[PDB]
Amino acid sequence: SGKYDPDLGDFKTIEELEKLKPGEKANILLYQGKPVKVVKRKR
Amino acid sequence: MNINPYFLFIDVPIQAAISTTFPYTGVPPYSHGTGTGYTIDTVIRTHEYSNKGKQYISDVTGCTMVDPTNGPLPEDNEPSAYAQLDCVLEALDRMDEEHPGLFQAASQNAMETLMVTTVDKLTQGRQTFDWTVCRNQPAATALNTTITSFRLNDLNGADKGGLIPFCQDIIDSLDRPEMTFFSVKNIKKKLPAKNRKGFLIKRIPMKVKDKITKVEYIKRALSLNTMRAIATAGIQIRGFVLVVENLAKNICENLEQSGLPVGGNEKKAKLSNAVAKMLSNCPPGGISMTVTGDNTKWNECLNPRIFLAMTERITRDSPIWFRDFCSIAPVLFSNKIARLGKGFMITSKTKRLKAQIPCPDLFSIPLERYNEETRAKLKKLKPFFNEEGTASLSPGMMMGMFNMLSTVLGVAALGIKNIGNKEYLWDGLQSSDDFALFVNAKDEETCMEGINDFYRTCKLLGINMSKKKSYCNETGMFEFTSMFYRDGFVSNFAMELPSFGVAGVNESADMAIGMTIIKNNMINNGMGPATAQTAIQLFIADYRYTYKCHRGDSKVEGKRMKIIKELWENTKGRDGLLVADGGPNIYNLRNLHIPEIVLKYNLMDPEYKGRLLHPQNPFVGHDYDAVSGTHSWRTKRNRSILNTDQRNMILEEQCYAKCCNLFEACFNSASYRKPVGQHSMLEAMAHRLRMDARLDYESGRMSKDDFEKAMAHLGEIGYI
C-alpha cells in the first residue's frame, strides 16, 4: 500500500505479522535497501 | 520429569554407553599444579617405597643413594621396589627359552641400526633440558648448544656425523677436569621508546663464556628438569636411551604378549585374538578369568639397576662395545638428580607483601614458616637434598623413559605361566603401564590362587599391581588401555578429536593436512562415518572463517569476497572451483586421500585451470599431499634481531637517541612518506627536508632568503 515510513517504526518480524489484525498496516524488508509497506487483507 | 543420564545404562551396555567420555587424549589445563611441591612429593614417594634398601654416599657426585634391589621382601601389601635379581634373571631365561634366537636377533638389529644412524636423529623429540643455560629448550637448539660447547672443549663428535662418536665424546666430556661452554646472559636496557618519555627498560641477551668444574658438569648432565611427563632429560642421555629403547622395541615386536607398538584396528585384532586363543585352550569344563589390572607407582618402583640387569642378560652374546653402549643408559639413570623447579612463594598479609623462595634457598628459613604439608615434605626430603637446589634420586623412573623395557619386564612377568605346577595357566597382554591377565583353571578358586601367585611374582620383580583399581570377571569382557572389549564389541574411552582452526601452513596445505588428519583419526582412533563427516563440516567452517573464503554465491561481504563473487559470476564450471575460491566443497569419506585440485581438475574451467596452475606465478615462488599452484603461497617469516654485533655496538655508542628523535618528528608528521628500500636514513631525511622546503616556499611559508639558506645547508649535506 505504500513505501518506507520510518515513523511507523522498524521492520516487523514474522512473529508480529502472524499476530496482526486485519486493517493494520506494517513494514517489511525484501532485501538490503529495498523496504516496503504492506497491509493485511481479509481475502 | 527429572532427567537421569545414568539411566541410559539400563537400555545400553555400559561399554558402549561411556564411549568417548573424554574428548581430549592430552592434558587438561586444570590438572593439579606440577610445581616444586609435586616434584618434591614424587621424590619423597620414590625414596619412601625403597627406604629399606642399602643407603650410601656416591663417591662421584657426593649425593645420597638408595639401592633396594635384592633387598628384604615385603611383609605388607604396600608398594615395594625390592626386586630380587634372581627372579628377573629367571624370567628373562624363561622368555629366551620360549622364544629361541629372539634376544640375539633383537640386539643385532639394534646395534646395526645404531651403527647406521646419525646424530640428527636426536633432534626428533620434545623439550630437552639444556645444561649450558639450565632450562628447557627445543631439541635442535639443545643439540646445537651441546655441540658448540663440545667444540669449545676440544670434542668434535658431531663432525664425524655418526652417533657412536657423539656418544663417545659425551662419555669423554664426562671426564674433563674443567668444561667451558657458551651461555646467554640478559642485561637491562636504556634505549628510547615512545610511550610518554622516549625511554624504556627491557632485557637484551648476550653470549658469554663460562667454565664449570668436573663435579658440576657431572651433576648437571644427570639432572632431570621439570616443565603426563614429570621431567625431561638433557642431551647426554638421549642417545643411550634411544638405543636401549630401540633394542626393547625390537624385542617387543616379536612378543605376542606385547601390546606395542600396535596402533589402529590392529589393537582390536590383538585383543580379540588373545581372548579367542585363551578361550580355545581352556580345560574342558574349566573356568577362564580375566583381570583388568593396573599398576600403581609403576615408574616410582622400577629400579634402573633392574633395567641394567635386563640389558646385560639380553645382550649376553654380543660385542663387548655394544654391551657397554647399551649399559651406559641404565647407569646414567641410576645416578639421576632431580631439579625441584622454580621454588615456593611466601606472603605477608599484614604488610601486603609476597616473595619467591628459589630451590637453593629452600631450607634457608625455619621450617615453621611453611604450611604443614610443605613442612613435613621438607623434613623428609632433607637427607636427599643437595646445596645446589637439587635432590638425589636413585630409584624411580619419573614417568616414561624406558617404556619399551617396562613392557619387556611385564611380558617377562607374564611369561612364567605357572608357579608350583598348580592347576592354573596364565597369560595376557601388557603395554608399558597396564596389563590384562587371563588365567585358565578348573574352578574360580584355583583361578584366584593363580592370580595371587602372579601378584606375588610381579611383586618379586618390582611390579606392583593395583588392588584399588583392578577387578576380575569371567573372560569375554575386559579393558586394555582405554579400550573396552565385550563379547566382540569394542569401544574407546577417550578419543582425540580435531581441534579448532586450520593447520597453519597455507590454503591448499591446510586443507590437505585437515583431510589427512581426519583420515588418520578414522584409521587409528576409530571415528565413525557420521562423526568423520561432521568433522569435515566443522573443518570446512573453520577454514572458511580463517581464510575469509566463503562461498562465491553467499551473501557475505569482505575484502576478498568481492573478487571471489566476481570469479564465481564469471566461471562456468562452478563445481570445479576450489573451496579457497568460494567454490563448493566435495570432500567425503571415499575421497579423503585425494587433493582437491586432482578431484576438481575434470570440472575446472580451462581458463581457470591455466590461471590457477600457471607454471610461473608470483605467489608459489620457490606430511601431506597437495598440488603446487597459486594457492601454495608463503607468508613472511622474518623477525627477531640480526646484525646483532653492529646493532649492539651502535646502540651502546651514545647519539642513537638523538637520531631517533630527529627521525620521529619528520617521518611521523605523515603516515608514510619514507623512501624505504635500503635508503640511508640520512638520505631520506635530506630528500624529506628538500621537499618540505620546496612546499613551504611554494605555499609561502618561507621567504626566498630562508629558501636559499635551506638549499645551501642541503647542498652541504651531499644528497643535493
Binding site: - | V502, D510, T546, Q616, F619, T635, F663, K709
Partner: protein, 100 residues
C-alpha cells in the same frame, strides 16, 4: 621550521657517532629496532594465521613480470605494495591478490 631542523642536523653531524649511524643504518633498519623494542614472537599457529590474514599484506610475493602484471588497486581494493620489503627482499602482496 626547515631551518631549525637543518641546524639541528648540522649540530648532530658535528658528532661522529650520530653521523656514522645515520650514514650506515637505513630506513628499513630503523623499523627493526622498534619491533624488538615493543614486539616479539607469538605461538598457537592456528590463531597466528587467523591474525595474519586479516592484515593488509601478509603474503610474500615473487619478483618478476608476472608479479608486476597484477595491478596495485582493483575496484577500490589494494593488492600489493611498491616499496621493497626487508625479510623477503621483495614485494609483499595481499590475500585478495591471489584471488585476482
Amino acid at each position: 621550521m626547515t631551518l631549525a631542523k637543518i641546524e639541528l642536523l648540522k649540530q648532530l653531524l658535528r658528532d661522529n657517532e650520530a653521523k656514522t649511524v645515520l650514514k650506515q643504518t637505513t630506513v628499513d633498519q630503523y623499523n627493526i629496532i622498534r619491533k624488538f623494542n615493543t614486539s616479539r614472537i607469538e605461538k598457537n599457529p592456528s590463531l597466528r594465521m587467523k591474525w595474519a590474514m586479516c592484515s593488509n599484506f601478509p603474503l610474500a610475493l615473487t619478483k618478476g613480470d608476472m608479479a608486476n602484471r597484477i595491478p596495485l588497486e582493483y575496484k577500490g581494493i589494494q593488492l600489493k605494495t611498491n616499496a621493497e620489503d626487508i625479510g623477503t627482499k621483495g614485494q609483499m602482496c595481499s590475500i585478495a591478490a591471489v584471488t585476482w
